[PDB]
Write a protein that binds this ligand. Structure first.
Ligand code: ATP
Length: 301
């Protein structure tokens, strides 16, 4: 076992309603950044999903192990920023500033005080993690009770993004996406390319799907407004400003009012209920930017 070779295990997109509690545990899906956390001698070290050393990017998490000073542990979990409803928000994480509070929500334990746990079944790793957290300041969200449909319904009532089901008998497989973990969201989600923006900072974004002849306008998506989402989103949009509309049809007057067009370089993810027959996203909401996705990969899902 070696923390410096570790990469997170990944979940397969699927449906959790139908899965039974006898074989499956159910966790809330937390929007944030995935972190592997090594705590030793009261000091913390961090690895991102890409294996990069990101310890310096999270000074908020330095105190994580000050309560664990006698332990040597490796944890898996999510760094999160909570919205005003208490729910992890990806956009608030992406737009965090120097005063923004960041938490680490742990959901796995991969090494504990001389015992490497990759081959230990999830159900047993969880009990060890819960015991560790009950005695310290580590934050370990509880499992959702019931079978998959009940767990999904509970997640929805809380306003959480979805559920991750994890097989109770499953080992931890670093760096692999596995059938033993199933991820399921309440909302349909669609990748879109940003073609322009309107002020309230940045009040809203004009979305499109790449096609022959340019972006096919998919509607305006409100940002929700952090008044820092906007200063930061403006920052990412500023190098892309252009006088040339990227859309395949010049935008209608109401959608073009006050618009700054951008080169169609940035992918974002939005939630939606259904497509309209004209190609617009109904009940859209902003999840956040997807900086590693390429516009050429964006297709109507
Ligand atoms: N409780 C949890 N246990 C494990 N992973 C979680 C949990 N909560 C959130 N995640 C992570 O959040 C993401 C939720 O799935 P989603 O489809 O939004 O991911 P993504 O970033 O689009 O794709 P990927 O699965 O490649 O990360 C996954 O990365 C998942 O591993």
């Amino acid at each position: 076992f070696e923390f410096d070779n570790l990469a997170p295990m990944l979940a397969t997109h699927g449906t959790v309603a139908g899965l039974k509690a006898s074989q499956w545990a159910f966790e809330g899906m937390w929007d944030g950044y995935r972190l592997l956390v090594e705590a030793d001698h009261g000091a913390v070290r961090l690895r991102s999903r890409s294996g990069r050393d990101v310890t310096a990017e999270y000074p908020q998490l330095r105190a994580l192990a000050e309560d664990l000073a006698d332990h040597h542990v490796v944890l898996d979990g999510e760094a999160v920023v909570l919205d005003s409803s208490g729910v992890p928000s990806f956009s608030q994480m992406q737009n965090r500033g120097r005063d923004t509070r960041v938490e680490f929500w742990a959901f796995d334990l991969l090494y504990l005080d001389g015992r490497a746990l990759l081959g230990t079944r999830y159900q047993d790793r969880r009990k060890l993690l819960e015991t560790l957290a009950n005695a310290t300041s580590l934050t370990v969200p509880e499992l959702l009770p019931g079978d998959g449909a009940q767990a999904f319904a509970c997640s929805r009532k809380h306003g959480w993004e979805g559920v991750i089901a994890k097989r109770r008998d499953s080992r931890y497989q670093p760096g692999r996406r596995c059938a033993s973990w199933v991820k399921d969201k309440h909302w349909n989600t669609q990748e879109v390319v940003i073609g322009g923006w309107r002020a309230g900072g940045v009040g809203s974004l004009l979305m499109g799907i790449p096609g022959p002849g340019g972006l096919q306008f998919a509607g305006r998506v409100g940002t929700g407004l952090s008044e820092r989402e906007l200063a930061n989103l403006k920052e990412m949009l500023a190098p892309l400003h252009t006088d040339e509309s990227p859309f395949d049809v010049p935008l209608p007057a109401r959608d073009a009012k006050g618009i700054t067009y951008v080169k169609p370089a940035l992918v974002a993810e939005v939630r939606y209920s259904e497509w309209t027959p004209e190609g617009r996203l109904r009940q859209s909401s902003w999840r956040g930017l997807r900086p590693d996705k390429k516009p050429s990969e964006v297709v109507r899902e």
